[PDB]
PDB file of C-alpha atoms and ligand atoms in Angstrom:
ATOM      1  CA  UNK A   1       8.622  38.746  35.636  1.00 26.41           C
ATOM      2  CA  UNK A   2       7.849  41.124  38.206  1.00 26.18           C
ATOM      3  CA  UNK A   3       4.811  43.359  37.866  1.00 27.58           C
ATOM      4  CA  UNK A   4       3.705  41.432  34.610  1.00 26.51           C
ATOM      5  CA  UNK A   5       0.208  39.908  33.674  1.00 25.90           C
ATOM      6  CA  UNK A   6      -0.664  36.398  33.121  1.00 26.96           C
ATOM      7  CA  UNK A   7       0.346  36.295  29.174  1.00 26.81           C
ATOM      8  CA  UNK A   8      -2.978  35.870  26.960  1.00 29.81           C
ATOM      9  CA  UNK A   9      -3.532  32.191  25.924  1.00 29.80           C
ATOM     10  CA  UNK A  10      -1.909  30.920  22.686  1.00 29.25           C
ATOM     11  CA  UNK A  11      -0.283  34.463  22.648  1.00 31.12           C
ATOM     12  CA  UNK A  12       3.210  32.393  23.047  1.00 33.51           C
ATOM     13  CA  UNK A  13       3.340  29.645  21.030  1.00 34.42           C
ATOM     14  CA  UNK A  14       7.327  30.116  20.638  1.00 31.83           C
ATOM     15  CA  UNK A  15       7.947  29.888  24.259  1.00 33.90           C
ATOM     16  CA  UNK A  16       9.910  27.221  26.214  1.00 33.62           C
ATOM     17  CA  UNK A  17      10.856  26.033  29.489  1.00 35.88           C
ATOM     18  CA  UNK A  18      14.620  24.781  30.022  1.00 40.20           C
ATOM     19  CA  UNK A  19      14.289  22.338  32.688  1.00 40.73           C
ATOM     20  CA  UNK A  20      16.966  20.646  35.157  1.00 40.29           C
ATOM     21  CA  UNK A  21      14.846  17.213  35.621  1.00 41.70           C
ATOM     22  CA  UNK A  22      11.444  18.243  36.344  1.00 44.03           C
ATOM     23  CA  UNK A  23      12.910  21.756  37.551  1.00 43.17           C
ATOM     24  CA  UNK A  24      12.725  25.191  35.770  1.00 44.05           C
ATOM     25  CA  UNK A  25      16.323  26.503  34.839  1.00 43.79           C
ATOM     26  CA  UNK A  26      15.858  29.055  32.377  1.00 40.25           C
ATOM     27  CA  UNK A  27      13.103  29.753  29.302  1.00 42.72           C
ATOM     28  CA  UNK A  28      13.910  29.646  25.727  1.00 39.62           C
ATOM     29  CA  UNK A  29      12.115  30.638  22.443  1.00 42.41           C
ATOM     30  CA  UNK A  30      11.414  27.634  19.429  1.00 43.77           C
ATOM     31  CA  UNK A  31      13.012  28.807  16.504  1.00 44.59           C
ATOM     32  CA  UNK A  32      12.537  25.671  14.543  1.00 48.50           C
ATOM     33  CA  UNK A  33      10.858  21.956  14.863  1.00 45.99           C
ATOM     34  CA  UNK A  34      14.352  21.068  16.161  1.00 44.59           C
ATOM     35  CA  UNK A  35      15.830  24.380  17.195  1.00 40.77           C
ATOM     36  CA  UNK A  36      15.259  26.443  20.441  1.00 42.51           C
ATOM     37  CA  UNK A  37      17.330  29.936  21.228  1.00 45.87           C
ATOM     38  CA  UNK A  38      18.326  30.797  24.392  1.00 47.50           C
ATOM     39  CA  UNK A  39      20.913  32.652  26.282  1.00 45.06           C
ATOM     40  CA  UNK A  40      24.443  30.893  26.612  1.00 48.69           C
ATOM     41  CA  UNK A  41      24.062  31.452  30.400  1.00 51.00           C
ATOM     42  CA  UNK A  42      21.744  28.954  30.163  1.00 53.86           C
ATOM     43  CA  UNK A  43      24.160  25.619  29.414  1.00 52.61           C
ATOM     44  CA  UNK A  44      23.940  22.272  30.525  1.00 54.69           C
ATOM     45  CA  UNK A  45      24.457  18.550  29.616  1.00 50.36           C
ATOM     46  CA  UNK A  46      21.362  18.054  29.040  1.00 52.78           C
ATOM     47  CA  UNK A  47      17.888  19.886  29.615  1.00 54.54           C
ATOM     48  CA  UNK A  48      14.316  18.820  29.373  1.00 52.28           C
ATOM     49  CA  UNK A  49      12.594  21.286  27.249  1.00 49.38           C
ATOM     50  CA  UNK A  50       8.792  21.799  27.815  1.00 50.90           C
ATOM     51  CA  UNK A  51       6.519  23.098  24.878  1.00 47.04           C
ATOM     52  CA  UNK A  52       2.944  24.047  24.045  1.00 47.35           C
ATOM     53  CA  UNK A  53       1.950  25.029  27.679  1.00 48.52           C
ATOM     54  CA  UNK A  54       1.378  28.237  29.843  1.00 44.32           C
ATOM     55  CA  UNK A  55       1.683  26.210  32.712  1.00 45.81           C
ATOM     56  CA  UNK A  56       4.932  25.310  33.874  1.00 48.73           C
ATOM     57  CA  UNK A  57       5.894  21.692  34.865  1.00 47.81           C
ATOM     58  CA  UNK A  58       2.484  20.900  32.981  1.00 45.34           C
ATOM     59  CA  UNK A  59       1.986  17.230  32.936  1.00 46.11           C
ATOM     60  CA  UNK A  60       0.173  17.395  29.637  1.00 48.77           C
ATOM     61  CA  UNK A  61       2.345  19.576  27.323  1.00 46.28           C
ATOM     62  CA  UNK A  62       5.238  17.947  25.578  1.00 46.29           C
ATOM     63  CA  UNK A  63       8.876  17.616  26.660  1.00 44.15           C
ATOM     64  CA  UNK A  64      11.660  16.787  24.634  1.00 40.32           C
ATOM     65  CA  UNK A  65      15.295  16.170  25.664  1.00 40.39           C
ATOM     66  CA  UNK A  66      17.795  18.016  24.557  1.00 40.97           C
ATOM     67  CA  UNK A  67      21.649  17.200  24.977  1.00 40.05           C
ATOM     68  CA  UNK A  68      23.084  19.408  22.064  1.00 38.86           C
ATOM     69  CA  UNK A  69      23.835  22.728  22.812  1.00 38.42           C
ATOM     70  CA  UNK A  70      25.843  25.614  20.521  1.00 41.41           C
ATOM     71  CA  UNK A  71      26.861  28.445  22.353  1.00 40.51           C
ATOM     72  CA  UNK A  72      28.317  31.249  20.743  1.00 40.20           C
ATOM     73  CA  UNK A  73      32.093  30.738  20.736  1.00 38.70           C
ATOM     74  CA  UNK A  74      32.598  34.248  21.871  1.00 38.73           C
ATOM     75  CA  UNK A  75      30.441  34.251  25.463  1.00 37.14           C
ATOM     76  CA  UNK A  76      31.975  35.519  28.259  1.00 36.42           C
ATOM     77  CA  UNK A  77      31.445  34.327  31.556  1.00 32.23           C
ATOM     78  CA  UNK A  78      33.204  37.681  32.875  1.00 34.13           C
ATOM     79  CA  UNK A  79      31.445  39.958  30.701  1.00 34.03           C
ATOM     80  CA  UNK A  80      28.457  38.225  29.552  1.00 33.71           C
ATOM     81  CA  UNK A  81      29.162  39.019  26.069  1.00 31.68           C
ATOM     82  CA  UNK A  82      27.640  37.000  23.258  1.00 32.66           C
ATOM     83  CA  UNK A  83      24.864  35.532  25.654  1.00 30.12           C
ATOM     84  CA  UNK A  84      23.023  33.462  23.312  1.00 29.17           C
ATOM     85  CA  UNK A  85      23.098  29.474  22.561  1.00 29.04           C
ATOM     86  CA  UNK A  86      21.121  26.817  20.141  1.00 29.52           C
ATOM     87  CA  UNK A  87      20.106  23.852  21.569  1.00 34.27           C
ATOM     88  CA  UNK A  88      19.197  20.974  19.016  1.00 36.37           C
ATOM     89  CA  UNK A  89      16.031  18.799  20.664  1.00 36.31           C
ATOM     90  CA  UNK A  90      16.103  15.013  20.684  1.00 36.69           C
ATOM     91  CA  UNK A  91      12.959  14.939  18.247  1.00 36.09           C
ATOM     92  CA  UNK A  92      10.803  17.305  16.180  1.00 37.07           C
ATOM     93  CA  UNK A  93       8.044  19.272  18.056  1.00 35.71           C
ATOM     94  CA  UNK A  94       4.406  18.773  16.564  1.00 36.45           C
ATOM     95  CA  UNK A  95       3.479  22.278  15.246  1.00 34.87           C
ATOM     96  CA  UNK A  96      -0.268  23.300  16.669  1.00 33.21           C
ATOM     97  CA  UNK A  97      -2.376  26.213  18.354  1.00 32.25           C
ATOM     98  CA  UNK A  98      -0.001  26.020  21.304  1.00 33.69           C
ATOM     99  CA  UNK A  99       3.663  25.167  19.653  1.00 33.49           C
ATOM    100  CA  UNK A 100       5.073  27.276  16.826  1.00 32.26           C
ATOM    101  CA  UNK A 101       8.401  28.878  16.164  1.00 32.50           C
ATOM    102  CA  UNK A 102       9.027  32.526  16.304  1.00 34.72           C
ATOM    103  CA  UNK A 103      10.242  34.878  13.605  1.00 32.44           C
ATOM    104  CA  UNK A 104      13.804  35.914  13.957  1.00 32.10           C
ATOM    105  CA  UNK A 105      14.513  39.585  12.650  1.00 30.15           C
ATOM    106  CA  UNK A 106      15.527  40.615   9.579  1.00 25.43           C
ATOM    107  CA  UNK A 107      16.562  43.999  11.007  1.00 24.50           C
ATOM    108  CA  UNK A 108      17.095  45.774  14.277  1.00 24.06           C
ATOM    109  CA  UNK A 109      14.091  47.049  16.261  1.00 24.61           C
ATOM    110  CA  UNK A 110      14.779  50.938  17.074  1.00 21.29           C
ATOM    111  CA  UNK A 111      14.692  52.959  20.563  1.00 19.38           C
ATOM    112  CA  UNK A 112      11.145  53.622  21.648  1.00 20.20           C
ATOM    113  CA  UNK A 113       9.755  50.167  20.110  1.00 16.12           C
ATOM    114  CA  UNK A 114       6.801  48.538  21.696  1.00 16.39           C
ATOM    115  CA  UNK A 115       8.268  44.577  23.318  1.00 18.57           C
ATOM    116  CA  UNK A 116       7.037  42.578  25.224  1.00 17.96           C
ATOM    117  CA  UNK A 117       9.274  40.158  27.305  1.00 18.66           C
ATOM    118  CA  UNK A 118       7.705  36.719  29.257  1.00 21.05           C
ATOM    119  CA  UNK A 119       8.290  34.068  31.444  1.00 22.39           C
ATOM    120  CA  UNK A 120       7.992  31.903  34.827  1.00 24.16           C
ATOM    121  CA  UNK A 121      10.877  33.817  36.702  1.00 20.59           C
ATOM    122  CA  UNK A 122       9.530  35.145  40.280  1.00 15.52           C
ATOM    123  CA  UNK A 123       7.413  37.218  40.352  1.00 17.09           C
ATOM    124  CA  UNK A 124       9.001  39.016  43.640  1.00 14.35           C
ATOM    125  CA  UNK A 125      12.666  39.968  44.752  1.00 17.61           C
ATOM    126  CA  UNK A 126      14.295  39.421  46.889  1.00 18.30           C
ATOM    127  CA  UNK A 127      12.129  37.479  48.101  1.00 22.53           C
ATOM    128  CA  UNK A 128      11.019  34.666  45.775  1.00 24.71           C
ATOM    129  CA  UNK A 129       7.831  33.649  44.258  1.00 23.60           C
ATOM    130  CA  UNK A 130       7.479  31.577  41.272  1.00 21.68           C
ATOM    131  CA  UNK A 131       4.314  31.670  39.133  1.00 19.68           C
ATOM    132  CA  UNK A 132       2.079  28.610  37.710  1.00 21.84           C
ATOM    133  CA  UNK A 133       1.100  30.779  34.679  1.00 20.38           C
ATOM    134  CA  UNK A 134       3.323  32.583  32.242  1.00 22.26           C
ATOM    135  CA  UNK A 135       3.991  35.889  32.666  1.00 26.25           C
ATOM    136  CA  UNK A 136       4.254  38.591  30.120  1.00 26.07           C
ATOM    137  CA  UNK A 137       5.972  42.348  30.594  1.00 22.72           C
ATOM    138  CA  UNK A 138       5.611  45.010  28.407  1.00 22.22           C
ATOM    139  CA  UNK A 139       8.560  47.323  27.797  1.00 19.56           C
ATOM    140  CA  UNK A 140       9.950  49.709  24.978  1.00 16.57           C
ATOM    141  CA  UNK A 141      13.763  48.981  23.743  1.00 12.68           C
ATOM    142  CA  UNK A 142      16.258  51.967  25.180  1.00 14.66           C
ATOM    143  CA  UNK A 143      18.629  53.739  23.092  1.00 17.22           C
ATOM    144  CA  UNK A 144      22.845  52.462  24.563  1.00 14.24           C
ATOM    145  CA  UNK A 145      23.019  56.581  24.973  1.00 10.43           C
ATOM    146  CA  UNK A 146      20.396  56.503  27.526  1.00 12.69           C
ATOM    147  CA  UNK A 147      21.314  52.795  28.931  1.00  8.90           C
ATOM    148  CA  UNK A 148      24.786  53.607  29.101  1.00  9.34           C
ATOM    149  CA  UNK A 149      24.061  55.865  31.214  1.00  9.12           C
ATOM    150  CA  UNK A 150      22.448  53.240  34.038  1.00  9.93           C
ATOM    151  CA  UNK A 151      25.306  50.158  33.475  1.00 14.20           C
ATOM    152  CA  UNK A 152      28.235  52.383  32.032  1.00 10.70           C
ATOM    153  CA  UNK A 153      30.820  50.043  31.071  1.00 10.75           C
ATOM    154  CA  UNK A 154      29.147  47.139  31.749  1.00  8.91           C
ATOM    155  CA  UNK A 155      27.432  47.535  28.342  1.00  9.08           C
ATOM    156  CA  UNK A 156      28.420  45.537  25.385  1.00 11.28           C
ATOM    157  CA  UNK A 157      27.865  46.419  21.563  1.00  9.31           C
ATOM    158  CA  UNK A 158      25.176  43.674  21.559  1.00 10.92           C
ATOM    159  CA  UNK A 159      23.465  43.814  24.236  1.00 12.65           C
ATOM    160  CA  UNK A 160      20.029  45.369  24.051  1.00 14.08           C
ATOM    161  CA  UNK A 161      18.041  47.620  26.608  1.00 13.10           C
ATOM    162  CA  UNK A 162      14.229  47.740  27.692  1.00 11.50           C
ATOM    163  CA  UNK A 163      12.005  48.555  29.791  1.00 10.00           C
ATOM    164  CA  UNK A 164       9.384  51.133  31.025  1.00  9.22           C
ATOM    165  CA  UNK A 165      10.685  54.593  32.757  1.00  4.95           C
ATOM    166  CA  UNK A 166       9.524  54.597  36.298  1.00  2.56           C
ATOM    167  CA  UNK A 167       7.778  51.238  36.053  1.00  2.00           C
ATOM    168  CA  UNK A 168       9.307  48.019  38.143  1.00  2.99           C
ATOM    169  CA  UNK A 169       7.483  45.828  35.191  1.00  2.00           C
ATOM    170  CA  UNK A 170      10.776  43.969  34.538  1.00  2.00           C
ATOM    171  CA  UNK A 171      12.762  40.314  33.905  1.00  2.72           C
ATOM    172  CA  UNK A 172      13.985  38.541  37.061  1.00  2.00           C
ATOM    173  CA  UNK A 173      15.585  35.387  38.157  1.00  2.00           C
ATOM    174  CA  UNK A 174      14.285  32.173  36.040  1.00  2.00           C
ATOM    175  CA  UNK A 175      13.244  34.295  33.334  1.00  2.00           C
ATOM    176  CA  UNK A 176      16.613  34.240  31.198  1.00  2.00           C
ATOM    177  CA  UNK A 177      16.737  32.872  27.969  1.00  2.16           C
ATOM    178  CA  UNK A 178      13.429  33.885  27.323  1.00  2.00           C
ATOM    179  CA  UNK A 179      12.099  35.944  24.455  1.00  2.00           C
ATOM    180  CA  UNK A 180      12.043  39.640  23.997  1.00  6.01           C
ATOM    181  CA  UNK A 181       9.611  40.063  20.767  1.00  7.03           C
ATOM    182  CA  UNK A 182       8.888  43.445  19.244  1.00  4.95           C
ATOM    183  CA  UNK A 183       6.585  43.998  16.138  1.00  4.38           C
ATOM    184  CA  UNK A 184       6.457  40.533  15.936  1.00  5.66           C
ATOM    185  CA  UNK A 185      10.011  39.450  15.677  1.00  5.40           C
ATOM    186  CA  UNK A 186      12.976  38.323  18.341  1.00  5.56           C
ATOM    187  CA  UNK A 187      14.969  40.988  18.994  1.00  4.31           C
ATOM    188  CA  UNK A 188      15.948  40.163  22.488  1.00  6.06           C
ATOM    189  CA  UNK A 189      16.662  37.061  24.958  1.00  3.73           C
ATOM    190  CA  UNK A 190      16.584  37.464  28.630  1.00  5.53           C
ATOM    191  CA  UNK A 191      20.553  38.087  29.819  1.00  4.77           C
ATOM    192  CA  UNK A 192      20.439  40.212  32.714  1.00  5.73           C
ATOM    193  CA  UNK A 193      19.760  43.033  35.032  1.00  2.92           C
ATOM    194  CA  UNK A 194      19.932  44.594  38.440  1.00  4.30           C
ATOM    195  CA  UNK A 195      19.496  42.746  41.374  1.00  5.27           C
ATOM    196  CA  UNK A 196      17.023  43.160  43.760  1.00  2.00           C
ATOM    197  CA  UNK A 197      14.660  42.990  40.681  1.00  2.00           C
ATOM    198  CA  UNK A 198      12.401  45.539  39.215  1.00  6.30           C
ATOM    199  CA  UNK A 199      14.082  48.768  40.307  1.00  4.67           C
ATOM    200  CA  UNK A 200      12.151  51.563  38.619  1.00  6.25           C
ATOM    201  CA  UNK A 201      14.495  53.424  35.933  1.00  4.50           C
ATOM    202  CA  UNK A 202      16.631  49.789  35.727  1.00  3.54           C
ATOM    203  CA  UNK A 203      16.903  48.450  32.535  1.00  2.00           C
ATOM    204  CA  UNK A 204      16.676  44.982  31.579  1.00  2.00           C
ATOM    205  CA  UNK A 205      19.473  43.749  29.573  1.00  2.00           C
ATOM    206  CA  UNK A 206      18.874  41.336  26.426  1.00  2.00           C
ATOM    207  CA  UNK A 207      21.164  39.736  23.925  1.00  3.33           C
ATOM    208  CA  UNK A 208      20.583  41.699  20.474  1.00  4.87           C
ATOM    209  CA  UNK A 209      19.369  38.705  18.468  1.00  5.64           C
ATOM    210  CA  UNK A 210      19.496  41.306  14.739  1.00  7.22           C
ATOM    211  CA  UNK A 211      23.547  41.256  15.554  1.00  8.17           C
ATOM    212  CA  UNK A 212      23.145  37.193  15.073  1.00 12.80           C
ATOM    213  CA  UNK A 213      21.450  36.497  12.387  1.00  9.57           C
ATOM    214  CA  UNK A 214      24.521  35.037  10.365  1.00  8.63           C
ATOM    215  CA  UNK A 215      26.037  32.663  13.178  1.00 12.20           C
ATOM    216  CA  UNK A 216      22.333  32.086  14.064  1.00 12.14           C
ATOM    217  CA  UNK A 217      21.466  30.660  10.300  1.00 12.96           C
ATOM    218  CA  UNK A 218      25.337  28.899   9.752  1.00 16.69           C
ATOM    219  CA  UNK A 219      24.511  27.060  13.189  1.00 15.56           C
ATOM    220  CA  UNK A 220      21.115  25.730  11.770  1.00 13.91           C
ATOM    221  CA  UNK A 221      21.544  25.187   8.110  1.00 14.66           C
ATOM    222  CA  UNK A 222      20.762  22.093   6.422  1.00 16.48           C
ATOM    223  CA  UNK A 223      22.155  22.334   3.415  1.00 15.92           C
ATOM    224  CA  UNK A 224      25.118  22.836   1.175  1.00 13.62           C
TER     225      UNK A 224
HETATM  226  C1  9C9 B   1      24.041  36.384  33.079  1.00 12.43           C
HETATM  227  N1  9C9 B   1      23.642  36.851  34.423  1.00 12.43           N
HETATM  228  C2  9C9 B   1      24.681  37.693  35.055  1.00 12.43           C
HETATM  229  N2  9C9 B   1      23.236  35.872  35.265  1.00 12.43           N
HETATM  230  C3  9C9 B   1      22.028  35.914  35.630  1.00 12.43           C
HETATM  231  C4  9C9 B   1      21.546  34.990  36.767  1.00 12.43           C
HETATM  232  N3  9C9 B   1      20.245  34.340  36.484  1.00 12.43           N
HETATM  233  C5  9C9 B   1      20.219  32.868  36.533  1.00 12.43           C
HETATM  234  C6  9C9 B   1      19.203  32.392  37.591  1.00 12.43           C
HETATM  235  O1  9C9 B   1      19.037  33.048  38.610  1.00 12.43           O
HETATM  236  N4  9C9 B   1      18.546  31.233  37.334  1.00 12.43           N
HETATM  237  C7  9C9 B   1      17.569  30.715  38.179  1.00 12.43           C
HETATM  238  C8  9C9 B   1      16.659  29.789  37.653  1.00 12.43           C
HETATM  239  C9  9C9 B   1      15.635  29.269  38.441  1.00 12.43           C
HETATM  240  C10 9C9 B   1      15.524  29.634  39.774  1.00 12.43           C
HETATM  241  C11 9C9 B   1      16.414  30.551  40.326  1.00 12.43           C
HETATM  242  C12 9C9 B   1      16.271  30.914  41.773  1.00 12.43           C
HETATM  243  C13 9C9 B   1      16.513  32.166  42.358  1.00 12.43           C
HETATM  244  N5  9C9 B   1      16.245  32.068  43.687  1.00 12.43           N
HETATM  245  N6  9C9 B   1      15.815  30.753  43.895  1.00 12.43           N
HETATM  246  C14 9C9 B   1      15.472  30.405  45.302  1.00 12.43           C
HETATM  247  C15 9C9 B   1      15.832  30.052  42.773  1.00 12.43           C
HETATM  248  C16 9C9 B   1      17.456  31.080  39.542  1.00 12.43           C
HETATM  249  C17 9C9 B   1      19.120  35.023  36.271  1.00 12.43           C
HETATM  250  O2  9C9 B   1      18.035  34.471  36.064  1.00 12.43           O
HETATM  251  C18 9C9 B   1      19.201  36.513  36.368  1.00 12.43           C
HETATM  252  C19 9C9 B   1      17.791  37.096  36.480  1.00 12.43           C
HETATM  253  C20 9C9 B   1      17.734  38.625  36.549  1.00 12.43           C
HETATM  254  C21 9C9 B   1      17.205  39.322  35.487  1.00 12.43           C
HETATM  255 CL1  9C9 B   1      16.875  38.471  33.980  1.00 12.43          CL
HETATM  256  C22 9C9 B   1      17.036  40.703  35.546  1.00 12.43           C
HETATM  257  C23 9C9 B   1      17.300  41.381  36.725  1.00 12.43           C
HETATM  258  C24 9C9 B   1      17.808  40.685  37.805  1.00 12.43           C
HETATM  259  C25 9C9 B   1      17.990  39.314  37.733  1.00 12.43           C
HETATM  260 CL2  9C9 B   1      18.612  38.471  39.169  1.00 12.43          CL
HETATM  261  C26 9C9 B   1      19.885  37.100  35.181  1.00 12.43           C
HETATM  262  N7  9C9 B   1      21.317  36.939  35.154  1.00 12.43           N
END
């Protein structure tokens, strides 16, 4: 996240950390006990996924292995379509102060909605510098029109648009996967951007989770 503010304690309970061994890959957002969201971008064989902590690589907070992952059939590695993947953990998470699953959206958040977007990607670019503490950015979802406009063609029917005009608050390397919540539901997951990082009047670019909600539900159900 660069030019973000340590997020306020407990004010992320739905917040994960993919890591490769002890090593931070991408974040994630719990959607379930056994469920965490994420973008498809994001695959391995196997991640260790951190919960209940600000603090990343904390030796207290509680990792779980996961090995099961469910991307959406249709992601593109070209395109970066469809950028969005379940990943079924080992074991249950214990629900408390610090661990609890986020509400997914029963509709789509319009242009001009308050977000805010967080994680442990650097905090600088191009140069590198990777934060202890979470980090939270606040941005406001942007009309396709408008982002269209910025990426063109490189803009797909699902992917979703924020940020802050003339502001480099923004998403940056380590961050995808994370969670984009506006008026209290998930309406984005980190995908991409522009690289250096944090170009005013660059948009970040999000999977639109609303577009999901079936394949999201079909891929968790429990029952007949
Ligand atoms: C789908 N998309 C095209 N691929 C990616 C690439 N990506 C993965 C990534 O960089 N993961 C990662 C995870 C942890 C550490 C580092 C890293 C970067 N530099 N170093 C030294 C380590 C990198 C990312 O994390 C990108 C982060 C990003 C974002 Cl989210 C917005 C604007 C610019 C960037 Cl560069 C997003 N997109």
């Amino acid at each position: 996240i660069i030019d973000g503010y340590k997020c306020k304690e407990g004010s992320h309970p739905w917040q994960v950390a993919l890591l490769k061994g002890n090593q931070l890959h991408c974040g994630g957002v719990l959607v379930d006990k056994y469920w965490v969201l994420t973008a498809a971008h994001c695959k391995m064989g196997q991640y260790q996924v951190q919960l209940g902590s600000d603090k990343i690589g904390d030796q207290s907070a509680q990792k779980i292995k996961a090995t099961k992952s469910f991307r959406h059939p249709g992601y593109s590695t070209k395109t970066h379509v469809n950028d969005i993947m379940l990943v079924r953990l080992d074991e249950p998470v214990k629900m408390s102060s610090k661990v609890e699953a986020v509400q997914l959206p029963e509709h789509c958040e319009p242009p001009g909605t308050s977000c805010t977007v967080s994680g442990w990607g650097t905090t600088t670019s191009p140069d590198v510098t990777f934060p202890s503490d979470l980090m939270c950015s606040d941005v406001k979802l942007i009309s396709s029109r408008e982002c269209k406009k910025v990426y063109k063609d490189l803009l797909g029917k699902t992917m979703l648009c924020a940020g802050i005009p003339d502001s480099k608050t923004n998403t940056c390397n380590g961050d995808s996967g994370g969670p984009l919540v506006c008026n209290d539901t998930l309406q984005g997951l980190v995908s991409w951007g522009t690289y250096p990082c944090g170009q005013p009047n660059d948009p970040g670019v999000y999977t639109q989770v609303c577009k999901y909600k079936r394949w999201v539900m079909e891929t968790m159900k429990t029952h007949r």
